[PDB]
Amino acid sequence: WPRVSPACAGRFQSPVDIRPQLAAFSPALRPLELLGFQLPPLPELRLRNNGHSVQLTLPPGLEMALGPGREYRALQLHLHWGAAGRPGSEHTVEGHRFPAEIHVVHLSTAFARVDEALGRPGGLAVLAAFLEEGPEENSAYEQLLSRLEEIAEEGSETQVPGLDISALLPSDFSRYFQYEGSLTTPPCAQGVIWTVFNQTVMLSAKQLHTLSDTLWGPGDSRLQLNFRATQPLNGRVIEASFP
Amino acid sequence: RVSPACAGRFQSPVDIRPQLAAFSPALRPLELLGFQLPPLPELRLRNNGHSVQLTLPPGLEMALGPGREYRALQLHLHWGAAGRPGSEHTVEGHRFPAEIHVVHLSTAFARVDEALGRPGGLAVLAAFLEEGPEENSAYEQLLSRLEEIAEEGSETQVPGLDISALLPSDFSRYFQYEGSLTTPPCAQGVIWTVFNQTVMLSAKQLHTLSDTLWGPGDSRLQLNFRATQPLNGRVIEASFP
Ligand SMILES: NS(=O)(=O)c1c(F)c(F)c(SCCc2ccc(C(=O)O)cc2)c(F)c1NC1CCCCCCCCCCC1
Ligand SMILES: NS(=O)(=O)c1c(F)c(F)c(SCCc2ccc(C(=O)O)cc2)c(F)c1NC1CCCCCCCCCCC1
Ligand SMILES: [Zn+2]
Ligand SMILES: [Zn+2]
């Protein structure tokens, strides 16, 4: 990874191990504001297998705020996962790796283009939630997972009807961890604001197997364990929106 | 064009109410590197008509944390008039005699105009100036030169000095909030760090600052502070409970 682009050996990279007892509570971290995420069924959205993950391109109008006057527009979402009987979340909590992780990537409003935001502090913000095993089938996630067989091949894509993107995220928008780090693939640009929800979302064991067993990557290898290793904080302090 | 960003919701200066400040233990001591200048090359001290400014050379590096790195561009002062305070920021309604600002540019940006309006592009360090019993010698190096730049738009060269000696010793205790520039264009996204500890000048020193320079026709350069702006739901953070 430092081979093909050396930003991946920068000092302030992601993902990181979250250690709640060492997190800094700041009352200034207000609840997350997400508007325009309840999408109608038309227009349909591009759901692509890109060889390294499954991604959903998002339209313009998904407005997000991390504070007052710190606004964002959602660009896309994608997922990280493991294999049969192996977790594949990127972030860990006290060394525990969760089954999977959703990332919703956004661009700061103050930037017109993604490539101006890269490497700039707060240019990009990601919302991250952990996916766990639960008793029920998750309806929001079945909308995406049921369509995965159709894009099993590296490079293929399909169209899915619009859905409530916020339905894919956890219950409590006032409880999260926050730090500044990087993208977790090349170019590994720094200045990315990561916000990681305290609460998880639940998927059936079948859904988690659908996600981990359906997609193929590059030759004929399985698209699995698509997570970067844990990176050192190097002096950074993870903050928390709750005592 | 009466400066459209000067009507933003999130402007500076503000009234700091310590009881409404949020303690955040993420806020570590500020670190400066390269503020101790050699005497040459000299720096340009300038009466720009609205303030006195010192332009700073390249290699003054400041950090607000790990990964939050800045380069110093300039400093300038805000002050009042005989018996009237002119700090920009207030604390629980109190206006201090004067204020120093050191304006910095993020090391993601090569030019000021790329940073303006961008979150965290510019960062200012701010400290209040009060009367103390002693002549402050770092300030004296600038204040003894104000007679040479009394005229609006004049300037003079001054030996490099310890720029960090114009600031308080205690870099641990401060307030921090997101706001704006206090002159047009008043662009938002500016990280303001305001020190708990103040800097001491002699009475004579403070009088020199307030009573020596002239502004735009033949009016004295005094009371060069903007009115305090509403927080408007922003929460000022504090590095200490
Ligand atoms: N965790 S992460 O957000 O960093 C991330 C990952 F970790 C990933 F593994 C991935 S998947 C591997 C990179 C990739 C992306 C798209 C294509 C394609 O469409 O053909 C091919 C390869 C990812 F997209 C994202 N996110 C973004 C792409 C990362 C490259 C930077 C380009 C600017 C951001 C563009 C939108 C967000 C997607
Ligand atoms: N508190 S503040 O930072 O907003 C500020 C003020 F409130 C001020 F009143 C002032 S003084 C009035 C603006 C000015 C600056 C320079 C000239 C000149 O050289 O001829 C003329 C007029 C100030 F300089 C600064 N700071 C200037 C220095 C930082 C470098 C330029 C960054 C671009 C923003 C342009 C506004 C001046 C900022
Ligand atoms: Zn990701
Ligand atoms: Zn100023």
Question: Which tags fit this structure?
Answer:
Carbonic Anhydrase II; transmembrane (chain A); 243 residues; 13-stranded mixed β-sheet; binds zinc ion; three-stranded mixed β-sheet; homodimer; binds the ligand NS(=O)(=O)c1c(F)c(F)c(SCCc2ccc(C(=O)O)cc2)c(F)c1NC1CCCCCCCCCCC1; 30% strand; 3 helices; mainly beta; Carbonic anhydrase 9 (chain A); globular; EC 4.2.1.1 (chain A)
Structure description:
Chain B: Catalyzes the interconversion between carbon dioxide and water and the dissociated ions of carbonic acid (i.e. bicarbonate and hydrogen ions). 2 copies of one chain form a homodimer. Chain A has helices at residues 114-117, 139-145, 205-213; strands at 17-18, 24-25, 33-35, 45-49, 54-57, 63-65, 71-81, 92-93, 96-97, 100-108, 124-133, 157-160, 176-181, 192-197, 201-203, 239-240. Chain A has 243 residues and is mainly β. Chain A has a single domain (1-243), classed as Roll (Carbonic Anhydrase II). The radius of gyration of chain A is 17 Å and the shape is globular. The interface between A and B is medium-sized, with 29 and 29 residues. Bound molecules: ligand ER5 (2 copies) and zinc ion (2 copies). Residues 48, 50, 52-53, 55, 75-76, 78, 103, 105, 114, 126, 183-185 of chain A line the site of one ligand ER5.
